[PDB]
């Protein structure tokens, strides 16, 4: 899915992902490739990930309704 | 704590259940729910199913 | 007995061959401009433009088959500063899209409803206010100009169940709302708080303020009733100062809130007695989620039937409606009509079927 | 037009799909995959030389200077701290969670000092000699110099923090900045007003809020986009502008209008310039002609193997200091291409020719928007910090398996 700012996912048509200007977001860090083993070729390979993440990496919502909660809010 | 109870403000006096009513969390840690102070929570689509509550602070 | 006579002129069919729910005319078109009407159904919405001499032509067609989308409502409106007609469609995912046929592109999308939108109406004095009744046990008012939620009608004592449909008063001061909770609860927009909220939304700017727009949750309705409808109510109108709500009892009851002599605008919130005045009766009309639209001049009220028949009513003669009026039948009417629409001038009427097969009629005039 | 908007939408969709494809080739091409999404969008990157590997904690204390490029919400200047798996990487170690080789939980990307800024943060170039001071570029006519030690952390809900050192020498918005590793101080900035300005810095006066420009280099007709010094010799530096000339200017030449090196080196706009300390002669430069060409100081008129791999304007180039014949470039084509010299001008198999020029060795395609900045890590061999306009900071190490035997 979209790998950029989740805020632009629910934006109104004509402005979503339009790249008009900078968009604020929540801090997040991602780690998925720890260290390659640098092993050799194996037939059994032809025949888990456990990624590491931190912070807020999504868009939140208000409690009263389904209005998307901005990071500034 | 043995009786699984809070601290009555009129009985547990020096413990901290009565002093500084209009302030932040008191010294006694067995009075947070009585004061109504809790941690901020958020709402977002859950990574498992539906909505989920994500806490802002550790 | 009536003094009207409509005749079938032309008809067509859609490509997707799926049931069509919402169909409304363009009442906002003045004289000279030929009549143009829209229809919905499945994931592909279609327009139409039928000329005289019994000729119907297709103008435009759209499709939204990217996902498992659906459409129910086809409310018509217009843009004041732009002066092109707009069509409102929503359902399934609950996204409300304002299609602009002139530019052939969507103008805005509205999300926030907990389920599919069931009905849509537009406010008469200000054409930018949309009455959206969502299925998440609530009703909402949308301001199209600012794309903000003006008020969330429902709460502590509001909309225990899903609101199937809602209407407007003749002058746009009082708002009715039927629902699936067998309730005809009503939310006035006449309070000073309603005016304050409307003005604030008119002069609101989401960019300027960091805090979200402070919607007015009207938890307590100004007037509610249960005894009128034994079952759920799916249609409602405002015959002047009376109420013409309709439910699955194959009848549109014409009643008035409170007692007989009390003024409607001075009815106390604690009133708990209602009186029935009129009731228009037909048969074979027991299906759910079907709407009726009366003529602008209020002399004509029409409600589609599931068998295939049509009914017109007289609502201006002395005393409430009586007698039997007349019925309109088409040669190729086999499906279920879910909505009917008149024109601003009482000369053109088009009925939609359960296959997006519009049947346009024409009065002798 | 509507067709143009539809084409842009399709292009964005294809960019997203290509990025999703690229994400899968993380382990087979990289040693580490660390991408952090800064809250305030990043416009620059750097690598602080601080390191600390205590006993019982195999990680190394690595600090990186992030950025802040949102419109206006209490503009800040973020400085964080990161770790490294070290020799004992311990990918699983039957206990990875922190991991068995470094910090993989809690303060992975924790922010140390957040000094409030006034405007936008274009560059975050620090002084390697004295890593305490960090310089910043803003849309205003003045530069900002901060200090993550003296300034308190945990910013209050306020703004317009005084940096106590503002370098006001420019006129319009600036986009260039570079410090001198050889001599402490000596920061130069290339701005949009057809010129590049340099400040003495170094022993700046205490609480020197008002700082004038020590020198201004106005010799390029068109807008400049980068200004980088020479690692081997601190007496000269290169000025690159939209005018088709990757000019190199020698300091103390008593000529602020005519650059010492006036070779055009291109026929289109140029927006990047850098050299290599191990390979002093090697000097990659970026351009709009998509023909970033290596040049030699001894022989600049002759054209060496122009790396025919770019597809747009190039704004940031940098060669790897640790290695000998490794160079790299990045620009508006959101690709970080790493050059190579051993395969330049040599025979290759048809598959190698189909893959591209033999001299081009590595290309990094982990960006969605225009690449803002990229830099190698002085401590780690291959770790590179590259940032884009989508508020994404990427820390990764190019695999050394290709340089085996
Ligand atoms: Zn106690």
UniProtKB/Swiss-Prot annotation, chain A:
This is Polycomb protein SUZ12. It is linked to A chromosomal aberration involving SUZ12 may be a cause of endometrial stromal tumors. Translocation t(7;17)(p15;q21) with JAZF1. The translocation generates the JAZF1-SUZ12 oncogene consisting of the N-terminus part of JAZF1 and the C-terminus part of SUZ12. It is frequently found in all cases of endometrial stromal tumors, except in endometrial stromal sarcomas, where it is rarer. Imagawa-Matsumoto syndrome: An autosomal dominant syndrome characterized by generalized overgrowth, dysmorphic features, musculoskeletal abnormalities, developmental delay and intellectual disability. Some patients have genitourinary and structural brain abnormalities. Signal peptide: none annotated. Component of the PRC2 complex, which consists of the core subunits EED, EZH1 or EZH2, SUZ12, and RBBP4, and various combinations of accessory subunits including AEBP2, JARID2, PHF19, MTF2 and EPOP. Within the complex, interacts (via C2H2 zinc finger domain) with JARID2 and EPOP; JARID2 and EPOP compete for SUZ12 binding. Also interacts with AEBP2 and PHF19. Forms a monomeric PRC2.2 (class 2) complex consisting of at least SUZ12, RBBP4, AEBP2 and JARID2. The modification Phosphoserine is found at residue 44. Induction: Expression is induced by E2F1, E2F2 and E2F3. It is found in: Nucleus. The gene is SUZ12. Belongs to the VEFS (VRN2-EMF2-FIS2-SU(Z)12) family.
Swiss-Prot record, chain B:
Coiled coil: none annotated. Phosphorylated by AKT1. Phosphorylation by AKT1 reduces methyltransferase activity. In the ovary, expressed in primordial follicles and oocytes and also in external follicle cells (at protein level). Expressed in many tissues. Overexpressed in numerous tumor types including carcinomas of the breast, colon, larynx, lymphoma and testis. It is found in: Nucleus. It comes from the Eukaryota. Induction: Expression is induced by E2F1, E2F2 and E2F3. Expression is reduced in cells subject to numerous types of stress including UV-, IR- and bleomycin-induced DNA damage and by activation of p53/TP53. Polycomb group (PcG) protein. Catalytic subunit of the PRC2/EED-EZH2 complex, which methylates 'Lys-9' (H3K9me) and 'Lys-27' (H3K27me) of histone H3, leading to transcriptional repression of the affected target gene. Able to mono-, di- and trimethylate 'Lys-27' of histone H3 to form H3K27me1, H3K27me2 and H3K27me3, respectively. Displays a preference for substrates with less methylation, loses activity when progressively more methyl groups are incorporated into H3K27, H3K27me0 > H3K27me1 > H3K27me2. Belongs to the class V-like SAM-binding methyltransferase superfamily. Histone-lysine methyltransferase family. EZ subfamily. This is Histone-lysine N-methyltransferase EZH2. The chain holds residues 574 to 631 of 746 of the full protein.
Curated annotation (Swiss-Prot), chain C:
Changing residue 120 to P: Impairs interaction with EZH2. The keyword Transcription applies. Expressed in brain, colon, heart, kidney, liver, lung, muscle, ovary, peripheral blood leukocytes, pancreas, placenta, prostate, spleen, small intestine, testis, thymus and uterus. Appears to be overexpressed in breast and colon cancer. Changing residue 117 to N: Impairs interaction with EZH2. Belongs to the WD repeat ESC family. It is linked to Cohen-Gibson syndrome: An autosomal dominant overgrowth disorder characterized by accelerated osseous maturation, advanced bone age, skeletal abnormalities including flaring of the metaphyses of the long bones, large hands with long fingers and camptodactyly, scoliosis, cervical spine anomalies, dysmorphic facial features, and variable intellectual disability. This is Polycomb protein EED. It comes from Homo sapiens.
UniProtKB/Swiss-Prot annotation, chain D:
The keyword Membrane does not apply. It is found in: Nucleus; Chromosome, Telomere. GO terms for biological process: brain development; chromatin remodeling; DNA repair; DNA replication; DNA replication-dependent chromatin assembly; negative regulation of cell migration; negative regulation of cell population proliferation; negative regulation of DNA-templated transcription. The modification N6-acetyllysine is found at residues 2, 154. There is a cross-link at residue 2 (Glycyl lysine isopeptide (Lys-Gly) (interchain with G-Cter in ubiquitin)). SMART domains: WD40. Expressed in neuroblastoma cells. Its main location: nucleus. Residues 1-126 are annotated as: Interaction with ARMC12. There is a cross-link at residues 2, 154 (Glycyl lysine isopeptide (Lys-Gly) (interchain with G-Cter in SUMO2)). It comes from the Eukaryota. PROSITE patterns: WD_REPEATS_1, WD_REPEATS_2, WD_REPEATS_REGION. It holds the Pfam family WD40. InterPro entries: G-protein_beta_WD-40_rep, Histone-bd_RBBP4-like_N, WD40/YVTN_repeat-like_dom_sf, WD40_repeat_CS, WD40_repeat_dom_sf, WD40_rpt, WD_repeat_RBAP46/RBAP48/MSI1. Keywords: Acetylation, Cell cycle, Chaperone, Chromatin regulator, Chromosome, DNA damage, DNA repair, DNA replication, Isopeptide bond, Nucleus, Phosphoprotein, Repeat, Repressor, Telomere, Transcription, Transcription regulation, Ubl conjugation, WD repeat. WD repeats lie at residues 30-119, 120-169, 170-217, 219-264, 265-308, 309-365, 366-398. Changing residue 271 to A: Decreased interaction with ZNF827. This is Histone-binding protein RBBP4. It comes from Homo sapiens (Human).
């Amino acid at each position: 899915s979209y790998a950029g700012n989740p805020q632009d996912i629910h934006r109104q048509p004509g402005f979503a992902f339009s790249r008009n200007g900078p968009v604020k977001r929540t801090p997040i860090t991602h780690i998925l490739v720890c260290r390659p083993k640098r092993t050799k070729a194996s037939m059994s390979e032809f025949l888990q990930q456990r990624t590491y993440s931190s912070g807020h990496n999504r868009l939140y919502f208000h409690s009263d309704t389904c209005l998307p909660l901005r990071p500034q809010e | 704590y043995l009786a699984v109870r809070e601290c009555d403000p009129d009985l547990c006096l020096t413990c901290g259940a009565a002093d500084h009513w209009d302030s932040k969390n008191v010294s006694c840690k067995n009075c947070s729910i009585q004061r109504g102070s809790k941690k901020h929570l958020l709402l977002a689509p859950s990574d498992v199913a539906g909505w989920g509550i994500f806490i802002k602070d550790p | 007995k009536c003094k009207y006579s409509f005749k079938c002129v032309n008809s067509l069919k859609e490509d997707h061959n799926q049931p069509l729910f919402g169909v409304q005319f363009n009442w906002h078109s003045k004289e000279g401009d030929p009549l143009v009407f829209a229809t919905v159904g499945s994931n592909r919405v279609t327009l139409y433009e039928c000329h005289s001499q019994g000729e119907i032509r297709l103008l435009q067609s759209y499709v939204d088959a990217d996902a498992d989308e659906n459409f129910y409502t086809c409310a018509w409106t217009y843009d004041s500063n732009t002066s092109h007609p707009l069509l409102a469609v929503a359902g399934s995912r609950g996204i409300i899209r304002i299609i602009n046929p002139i530019t052939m592109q969507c103008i805005k999308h509205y999300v926030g409803h907990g389920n599919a939108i069931n009905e849509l109406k537009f406010h008469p004095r200000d054409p930018n206010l949309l009455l959206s009744v969502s299925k998440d046990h609530a009703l909402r008012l949308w301001n199209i100009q600012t794309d903000t939620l003006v008020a969330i009608f429902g709460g502590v004592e509001g909309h225990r169940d899903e609101v199937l449909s809602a209407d407007y008063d003749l002058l746009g001061e009082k708002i009715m709302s039927c629902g699936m909770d067998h309730s005809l609860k009503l939310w006035r927009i006449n309070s000073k708080r309603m005016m304050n909220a409307i003005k604030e939304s008119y002069d609101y700017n989401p960019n300027k303020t960091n805090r979200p727009f402070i919607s007015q949750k009207i938890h307590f309705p100004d007037f509610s009733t249960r005894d009128i409808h034994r079952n759920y109510v799916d249609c409602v109108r405002w015959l002047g100062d009376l109420i013409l709500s309709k439910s699955c009892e194959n009848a549109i009851v014409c009643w008035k809130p409170g007692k007989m002599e009390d003024d409607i605008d001075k009815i106390k919130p604690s009133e708990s007695n209602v009186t029935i005045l009129g009731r228009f009766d037909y048969s074979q009309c027991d299906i759910w989620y079907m709407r009726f639209s009366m003529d602008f001049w209020q002399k004509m009220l029409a409600l589609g039937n599931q068998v295939g028949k049509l009914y017109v009513w007289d609502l201006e003669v002395e005393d409430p409606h009586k007698a039997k009026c007349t019925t309109l039948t088409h040669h190729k009417c086999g499906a279920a009509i879910r909505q009917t629409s008149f024109s601003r001038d009482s000369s053109i009427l088009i009925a939609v079927c359960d296959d997006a097969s519009i049947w346009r009629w024409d009065r002798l005039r | 037009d509507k067709e143009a908007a539809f084409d842009d939408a399709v292009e964005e969709r294809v960019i997203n799909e290509e990025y999703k494809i690229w994400k899968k080739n993380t382990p087979f091409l990289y040693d580490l995959v660390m991408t952090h999404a800064l809250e305030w969008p990043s416009l620059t990157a750097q690598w602080l030389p601080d390191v600390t590997r205590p006993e019982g904690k195999d990680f190394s204390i690595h600090r990186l200077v992030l950025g802040t490029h949102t419109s206006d919400e209490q503009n800040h200047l973020v400085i964080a701290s990161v770790q490294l798996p070290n020799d004992d990487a311990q990918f699983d170690a039957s206990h990875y969670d922190e991991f068995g080789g470094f910090g993989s939980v809690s303060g992975k990307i924790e922010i140390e000092i957040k000094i409030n800024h006034e405007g936008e943060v274009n560059r975050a170039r620090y002084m390697p000699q004295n890593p305490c001071i960090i310089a910043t570029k803003t849309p205003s006519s003045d530069v900002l110099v901060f200090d993550y030690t003296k300034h308190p952390s945990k910013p209050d809900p306020s703004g317009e923090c005084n940096p106590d050192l503002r370098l006001r020498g420019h006129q319009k918005e600036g986009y260039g900045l570079s410090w001198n590793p050889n001599l402490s101080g000596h920061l130069l900035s290339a701005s949009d007003d057809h010129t590049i300005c340099l400040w003495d810095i170094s022993a700046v006066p205490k609480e020197g809020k008002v700082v004038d420009a020590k020198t201004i280099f106005t010799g390029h007709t068109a807008v400049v986009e980068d200004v980088s010094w020479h690692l081997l010799h601190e007496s000269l530096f290169g000025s690159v502008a939209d005018d088709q000339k990757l000019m190199i200017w020698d300091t103390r030449s008593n000529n602020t209008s005519k650059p010492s090196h006036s070779v055009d080196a291109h026929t289109a706009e140029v927006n990047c310039l850098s050299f290599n300390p191990y390979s002093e002669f090697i000097l990659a430069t970026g351009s709009a002609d998509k023909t970033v060409a290596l040049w030699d100081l001894r022989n600049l008129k002759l054209k060496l193997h122009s790396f025919e791999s770019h597809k747009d304007e190039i704004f940031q180039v940098q060669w790897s200091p640790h290695n000998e014949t490794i160079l790299a470039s990045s620009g508006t084509d959101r690709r970080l291409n790493v050059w190579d010299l051993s395969k330049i001008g040599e025979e290759q198999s048809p598959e190698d020719a189909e893959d591209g020029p033999p001299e081009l060795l590595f290309i990094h395609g982990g960006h969605t928007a225009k690449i803002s900045d990229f830099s190698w890590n002085p401590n780690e061999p291959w770790v590179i910090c590259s940032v884009s306009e989508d508020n994404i900071m990427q820390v990764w190490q190019m695999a050394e398996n290709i340089y085996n035997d």
